[model samples]
Target chain A: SAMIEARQVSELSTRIISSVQMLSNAQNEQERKEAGRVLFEQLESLLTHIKELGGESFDSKLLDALESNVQNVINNLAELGVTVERKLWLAKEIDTRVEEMRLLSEELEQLTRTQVQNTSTIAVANVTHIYDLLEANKKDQVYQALDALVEVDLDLTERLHELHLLAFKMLNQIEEARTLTNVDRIQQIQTAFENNLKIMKRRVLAVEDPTRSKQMSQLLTELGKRQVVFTILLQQYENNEQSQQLMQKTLELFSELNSTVNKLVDDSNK
Target chain B: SAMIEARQVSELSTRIISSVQMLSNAQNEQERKEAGRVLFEQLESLLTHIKELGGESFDSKLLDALESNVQNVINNLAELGVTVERKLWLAKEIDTRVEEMRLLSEELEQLTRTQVQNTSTIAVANVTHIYDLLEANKKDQVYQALDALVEVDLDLTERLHELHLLAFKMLNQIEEARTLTNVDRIQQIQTAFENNLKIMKRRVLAVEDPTRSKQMSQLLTELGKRQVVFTILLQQYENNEQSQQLMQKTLELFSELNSTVNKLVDDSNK
Candidate 1:
């Protein structure tokens, strides 16, 4: 029976890998959720099979490896869930900013259209003869055209300078948002870890066997120590939720700024 | 009469400054061109007035300074004309690329919208209760949600990674185009210098008086030397027309790449 259970556990582990692959390749959210559900089922079955073997009867090393794998699978699923939620939330938030930028771009497009019209008329009136001059090798006509267009060049140079400065500003904001997102990610991981610890504590208490209890106690102690070290490393004064909100706000600001700058670049180019 | 001529020259210079300001502040291209025309007329009148004073009659230093100033104005106008033409050409080229990118963006938007729809459905079906669980401090519900959403997260992360790489490629192209534009600008200055030298040569030959001819000849020699130095510095393998076409092509590529990347960023965020 023990041998049968071991084979079953190994087969389930193999299935989990396949399920993860399906999840990764999932075309839509429903498919992803279904694949994840399968993976969770496999992980649970493997854990239950290992538990039935009992700590005394099973090879300690194999049991330990299986147990660790099961825990990892569970942790991965938890992490993935939160990540999807956060991503979706961010997408919604940024969508609004994108729309705002789209409106601004429309305004800029109108401005550029007018500029293009003006340039087209000027080019027709002043530059048409110059092209003919170049073709005819008439240096005098070429010189005449060159003389006529100098102010237009100065105007463009000045506008290009302003646009370049705006692009730099946009780049700076993108960097700031990127940094804030990274910091917020760290906080998210910490929150997830804390939640996992609480779940593990409950699971450990539910297990009646002394050996399993002892093993879980050791794992819990290690986890606690790691948490303490991580907390010291972070040294953050703000709470996770607050930081998350701030990060989201920063991202929105960055998106708005980015769109604005992009529109300006497009406008100036026009 | 000499005092009146000096006053007239100074007044023309003052008018040039004001005309330049108007050209700069002109709300449209037509207005700019008009202001530039007025400035050119003023510069020409000043040159004619100075020429009437004759080289022997005027202070040689003052005459040299005034001649230099008039030449500067002419050169500036010639340079401005070419600059405006190049800018408008680039603008038209970029506009086509921008249109191409807009289409790509629409495609990306469609993809994102489908993704969002999928995510929304999954969130509603599987993760809606998780938010309430968090509010109520139910760790088990949080764990359940995490387990259910891992696959969704993995999918999003993969897409985000692809989008990020695309953005980097776009940025690389933009930088390339920007560098090329700067190089082309240097070539432009050289072209302007060459044109100015030819104009000065014509002017010098027109002056029959030996002293005036000698002074103008000396100025032309200095300009010729400057042109040679600038040409050596540029070390251009391509002629002006060829480089101008290449610059326009680069601008088109940059605009397309920029718009594509910007769309991806916006879509991913959405």
Candidate 2:
């Protein structure tokens, strides 16, 4: 009986799973911390026990990866601030881990819903916009900055139109098409984005008007930065969960890019 | 009360969710298809119902995305063959959708588990490698193909070493680092892979040995194709779930690439 029976292992596994659920449902922050810590410790011991059992069988690999995932969540949690922020991170973490574990039984499914329902306010509020990470104030700041720049040399309206079209094509593919389709979409956009940048770069080199040249330079730099951000987000969105937040953010960036080009055109005309 | 109420909406939503769960839990292939068709019809009506009541609010977006996700899964299902392939794809499709809906609570979690547990054989078997899309027999075919080629002008040992180093680094970052680190890894590897290919290309252009030149040309072509496959998988792996299958596939390809270079060296020595 002292020998680690499969039934014995089953009991520990169930209790460990129970603790993780409780952590998700804890009454408050300190208790939440307690439950998380308790759960991690149990996971630590169980992982150690699995290691002693020897070969890297399916169970061993699965458990180790799951523990690493949990630890990553813990590490992620240690860096955040605010009550809602803490709760939001925890819920996302749990949801992600459950996905990693591939644990969508009717039992855990209810727990998943409970965790979501428990914090539906934060969860729903968080996903309300695609660009949750891009603060509204910053968007306005960039928008205003774009309209103030004056470079009438070459209107990039057509270029921006093509890019925006590609962006919509990408978002649409993500919504309904298989991933390989999204791949082609991203490929097309990346090529278009780079080609436009190169065209702008060449134009800036030939300009003689100091004021116009300087303004064009700044606009190019700003475009460069934003494109980097957008590209990184695309990579993240494509390679990770098809998060609504990422999709919305992508849409926002595309819209901003369109309006951004329009602002430049308006400034040049003036 | 003839008009729709939130309670009425709630009933439809819950039933829709239940049907999805049943599609995942059907007894056999024919029964599974029946349940899936039934779920889609209900979803079609529900989405239509939702569209009528909406000005692009939260529910409409979420429902549309979910329905689109389901349809994508159905379209994907239509393209596959084999009983195991059908079941495996369905299970994967369901897991991905449930994740999109963010439906983890206790209820759906159990259903998720049951679906997984029901098809544990296929699900587990599928994830055993990172390169499920890659075939073992093909791997051996490539391995043999490499040994038969001949090229001796440049060692390229250092180049191969650096490329493999970056590959390991990328894999390590995926296992632990935030995606941004993986981004840097991909960046480094892309640069290295391109630089090495350039070096080989120049070497081939300068070589005087007819046999060596032609064999080197063929080898470079093979390397180019494999790198494209590897790069695509890297994008898919990083941008999607931390799938063990993808990771193993990457490992296999990298290992093959390294052995491929050694085969070149071996042929050169012979």
Candidate 3:
């Protein structure tokens, strides 16, 4: 099944590149418009396929290449005078879908680990008590319980690369969102904000390895705070026209996230 | 008269900044629209003011600052969702006007030097003979005539700095033009292309110092070739939608110009 999924993704990647080439070679405005439309449809379909495969079976490098190509196609279309709102909508959708796949894979990995441990356990009361604790304070307890373990089993390279990609995607959306006033685009930006928060939340809870989980949780917390500021910006978008301050604040958040991720990447290499 | 011109430019610069602030502080889309309109009008008016000064006495640094501020205002307005065509128009206008001023100043300097030399000459026949030669094979004769002089009395710092500024302005226009598709905007891009070519042509003719003149002329030749390619791109835009290649070519030219100017600056500083 995984091999089939990989093959499917590879096929979609090929289709996307062809569509981008068609858009680049279009001979008139109408043809350009048609090509852009087709290109975006391919992007959306590719995103759907990626989501279906989740993230575990896919090569990280392939995901990175897919993202880079999507960005190039979007940039070219933008240069060709495509609407910002449409581009932003497509971008947010791709980001959400990709993040969802990553989170799903992480969740599956955690479940498998839990099941492997359960094979050696036979205490019903202990299991029920632990479930009760998890139900009550899963968000806080999960990280705290692992804090003392301090084992860094997670591959920092993969995690940092994914974080870098996430930051790149979010920053691009923020830039596009800043130029737009359409209600729908604003709503999509809001959805993007919420989607990022959910991805970070799941990432924080799903990573069981202590040191790596701590690093990711710290990055996610910073990202979450940025989302709070972003939410405020969105609220102001409805009633206020002065977004410079909010925009600057949001950009600062992006910068902080960028640096935090970079620092982790650097430290891990050391 | 020159001091008054300086004061006038300074006053307009102040006004432009104020309009930029108003635009940044606008409270809604309607207010942003109003402020943005006012901002561009002020920018256009400022360009007219600078044109009235005719570039003869304006400090290069002052002109540099003015251009930089104008760009910042354009960027701020673009963030507010002003049309790309409008932004491109304003940017091209500013670039053309600023280059005109620099070339004008260079022309005046050359005329002043020629008049100082003519004061010692007695033979009208020799003067007229030289004029005939200049008219007959001007482009070929000019560089050949400079080859023997080989003197570099022109301040390397000032010439290099001005070249840097000119290259900067041209590259910015290329970038802004890449985003636009309107026929009018394309025409403006053509105008911008011609404007840069004229500026380079005058710079080549005006520089009497051999090394600097050679540098200016070489840059001009490259710029002229790029303009030829750009002209063809503009022609193709009428029928073809495949501008990605053109955009890439233009960017390559910009990179070449940038590196050439940087090398000169570095050589001068050394």
Candidate 4:
């Protein structure tokens, strides 16, 4: 995934270079107008793709493309007159989108740890429930069920712990960025966010346990909440409509988590 | 509006002061939890009120209540370890909201100019049309229509120049911000943006020309586009979300101007 994203970002960068050249070549109003339209449209499309690549399933392969596209857009638009308006708009858009992707990456990293923690807690509880039930019944069937629960729980506990520690290390890196507080910090955080997100994608795609699924839901819910808070903050600071989407997603995830938790309780009772 | 915002912000400052005190007073987990919840709730409510204000329809009384509630909550939460997550989140949220409100205010100011320009542009076009009609018809009714159109057009032309000057000034201020890469320069630009916005707001409310009604729709469309652009940019640079609402608002207002120009061309064709 990282490789794919890098490639896409690289392609976007190439497109931007050509688009700028086209803009410069325009010697008449008709050409200028056409070039302007093409430039903006190309920029808009490339930005959209970059946003998608920054998603939970983000890939590092797109970074060079993304960075080049961004730089080209800013550098190319830096000299136009009222076109400065377009330039500023483009620059600001690229900056914000990058930040959004960066944030998503961070959340993905954090989610991994939280998911592992929640999974461990749930697994332990499930095993304890099964053990209690077996002692209460003292039947062969009950013992068999308890044995199965313990086996899964033990295996998952170690795996979950390993994943959790990896995520924790990523989270620590994020924290370090907060302390450093500069462009380098921003860059590092963004890089870490993307990298950690990939780590998370790997783990989630590989895991098959139903318990992990429940944990995933919880992780997503918490992440959604964090995103909501971030979005509201963005709305306050920058007037981004994406914040509204984040808030909506947060509410949706919370609802899903509530249902999942309730289902688990019901199943346990049965 | 500035007075109202100043009052609300000041009140928020006081709340933060008290919340710090509250955090210090908390002695146990339960106390800290209660304080944290109160702090969070207060911040949320204040945020809602801020949003209403940004939407330009907030009640002064509600603003007052929000201020008080925030103060009380902050007082309650003042010494508790408001978790790094909570503090960072709150700081960022407050920063962005303040910036958003500032941006809205600036956009509102720009909208005023677009409103005036729309009227002047339409009046000029109408006069030219009427002149052509009268010349071709050589009829009494045509002459009467031409006279009315000329009279209205001349009067609107004066106001139009004034509006254009205002917009030019606003745009120039934005340009200055763009040119100056230093922090001090940015601060200076921000200060100018606020002062100019206030001036524009006063000018808008004082205008009473009936001809102004003619261009209202076009003016509105232009303002809307500018606002969108401003909003988009604001969202992008919200990294310093708390301190930059005014800057974001400026971007939205500029975007409105860009859109208004497009609409002006469209309107001219019609």
TM-score of 2: 0.23
Worst 10 residues of 4 chain B by lDDT: B258-267
Better of 1 and 2 by lDDT: 1
RMSD of 1: 42.4
Off by over 4 Å in 4: A1-91, A102-114, A117-121, A130-150, A161-194, A210-270, B1-270
| Candidate 1 per-residue C-alpha lDDT over B1-270 given as tens digits, one digit per residue, 9 for 90 to 100 | 443343344335435544543443344467757877886787688677656543325345544554555554555555544444444444445444434433433343343334434443453444445546545655555555544444453234223323322322223222222113234444654465466556545644553447645654564554355344333333322333443343233223322322222222222223
Q: Sum up the clashes in candidate 2.
A: 43
Clash count, one per candidate: 4, 43, 2, 47
| Whole-model lDDT, model 2 | 0.36
Model 4, position B150, has a per-residue lDDT of: 36
CAPRI grade of model 1:
incorrect
Per-residue lDDT for B1-270 in model 2, tens only? 212322233234434434543443355667666776886686676555444433223344444554454344334323221232345454454334333322212222233223223232332232223122123434443222222211110112212222322322222222221121234444554565566666655655463547645654564554444444335434434433333223223223322322222222222223
How big is the positional error of residue B82 in model 3, measured in Å on the Cα after superposition? Answer: 36
Best candidate according to TM-score: 1
Q: Write the per-residue lDDT of candidate 4 for residues A124-211, one digit (tens) a residue.
A: 4554454454445444554454345335543454456446544554444433322221343344445554565466556765677676
Comparing to the true complex, what docking class would candidate 4 get? incorrect
Tens digits of per-residue lDDT for model 3, B62-128: 4554455445444544543333233334435544644543453344334433432332231222223
At residue A96, give the lDDT of candidate 4: 58
Task: After superposing candidate 3 on the true structure, give the runs of residues whose Cα lies further than 4 Å from its correct spot.
Answer: A1-270, B1-156, B174-182, B240-270
B257 in model 4: Cα distance from truth in Å?
Answer: 42
